[PDB]
Amino acid sequence: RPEWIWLALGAALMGLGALYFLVKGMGVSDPDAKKFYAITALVPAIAFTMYLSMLLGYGLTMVPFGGEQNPIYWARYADWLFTTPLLLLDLALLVDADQGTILALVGADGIMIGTGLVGALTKVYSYRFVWWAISTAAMLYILYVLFFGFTSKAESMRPEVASTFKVLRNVTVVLWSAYPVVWLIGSEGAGIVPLNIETLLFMVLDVSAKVGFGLILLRSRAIFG
Numbered sequence: 366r367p368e369w370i371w372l373a374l375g376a377a378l379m380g381l382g383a384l385y386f387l388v389k390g391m392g393v394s395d396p397d398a399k400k401f402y403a404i405t406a407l408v409p410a411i412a413f414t415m416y417l418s419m420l421l422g423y424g425l426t427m428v429p430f431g432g433e434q435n436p437i438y439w440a441r442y443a444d445w446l447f448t449t450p451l452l453l454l455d456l457a458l459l460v461d462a463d464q465g466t467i468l469a470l471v472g473a474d475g476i477m478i479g480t481g482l483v484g485a486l487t488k489v490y491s492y493r494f495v496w497w498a499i500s501t502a503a504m505l506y507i508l509y510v511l512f513f514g515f516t517s518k519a520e521s522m523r524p525e526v527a528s529t530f531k532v533l534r535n536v537t538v539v540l541w542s543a544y545p546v547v548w549l550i551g552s553e554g555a556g557i558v559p560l561n562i563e564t565l566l567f568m569v570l571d572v573s574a575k576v577g578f579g580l581i582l583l584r585s586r587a588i589f590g
């Protein structure tokens with residue numbers, strides 16, 4: 366399986382990212398700051414587990430569509446189901462979002478990843494893209510609440526919080542927006558690029574969205590109470 370190279374590198378970078386965050390957090394006692402270390406280290410730990418599972422051949426299924434048997438890594442969606450809500454919780458704790466907003470984001474993130482997977486398992490080529498469209502609408506709902514709602518909340522807090530939140534907000538909009546496009550061009554969608562290139566592109570986005578995001582958050586004074 367040519368994609369195995371990117372599964373192995375993906376596992377190695379998520380694993381080292383998780384260990385990095387844990388070692389950096391050992392120099393921290395602030396209760397507020399520890400909550401962000403715990404969440405931010407768990408995200409690449411979950412991704413490490415799912416990349417290792419896919420590398421060893423677990424979390425793969427064949428879906429017939431477009432008159433072919435198509436390899437679909439469903440473990441990718443299992444990873445995203447747990448990690449995308451932890452990343453949204455990092456942002457929600459930074460701007461001290463209320464519990465209702467937190468539930469609405471988790472729910473919307475559940476629809477985004479759930480309909481993602483339904484589309485990936487859909488046997489009628491055409492309907493794959495209806496589910497992609499619903500998943501994308503849910504992502505746009507999330508990015509709207511983050512970009513407009515959370516910025517407004519962050520601007521009513523201390524400037525250190527507004528400043529860190531804006532950088533994390535900018536990275537999230539850019540990286541999250543790439544995912545639906547990679548799905549469209551990859552083996553899950555139109556099959557313009559082969560599985561091994563889809564895997565490489567998801568791996569770069571995942572490492573950027575977990576380790577990159579995590580470095581920006583945990584280097585900031587905004588996480589201290």
Ligand SMILES: *C/C=C(C)/C=C/C=C(C)/C=C/C1=C(C)CCCC1(C)C
Pocket residue numbers: 412445448449452477478480481482496497500501504541542544545548570571574575
């Ligand atoms: C750690 C990984 C992260 C930040 C993953 C993000 C994943 C997405 C934003 C996925 C979104 C998708 C759509 C909006 C369209 C349909 C397919 C998905 C699931 C790739």
Ligand SMILES: CCCCCCCC/C=C\CCCCCCCC(=O)O
Pocket residue numbers: 505506508509512538
């Ligand atoms: C600049 C990046 C913004 C990304 C988050 C929003 C994603 C798109 C979702 C729905 C459309 C929102 C309408 C945007 C108009 C701008 C309004 C304003 O700046 O006052």
Ligand SMILES: CCCCCC
Pocket residue numbers: 426439443486
């Ligand atoms: C056929 C794979 C189903 C995915 C389980 C969440």
Ligand SMILES: CCCCCC
Pocket residue numbers: 502503505506509
């Ligand atoms: C699906 C679009 C979400 C934006 C809310 C105004």
Ligand SMILES: [Kr]
Pocket residue numbers: 373374377
């Ligand atoms: Kr590797």
Ligand SMILES: [Kr]
Pocket residue numbers: 384387388
């Ligand atoms: Kr550690």
Ligand SMILES: [Kr]
Pocket residue numbers: 403404407
């Ligand atoms: Kr956590």
Ligand SMILES: [Kr]
Pocket residue numbers: 411414415
């Ligand atoms: Kr996991």
Ligand SMILES: [Kr]
Pocket residue numbers: 410411414
């Ligand atoms: Kr895990």
Ligand SMILES: [Kr]
Pocket residue numbers: 418423
């Ligand atoms: Kr596994």
Ligand SMILES: [Kr]
Pocket residue numbers: 418419423424440
């Ligand atoms: Kr799995």
Ligand SMILES: [Kr]
Pocket residue numbers: 443
């Ligand atoms: Kr799983």
Ligand SMILES: [Kr]
Pocket residue numbers: 411415443444447
């Ligand atoms: Kr998982």
Ligand SMILES: [Kr]
Pocket residue numbers: 411447
């Ligand atoms: Kr988990």
Ligand SMILES: [Kr]
Pocket residue numbers: 450451454471
């Ligand atoms: Kr969460």
Ligand SMILES: [Kr]
Pocket residue numbers: 452453456537
């Ligand atoms: Kr996020």
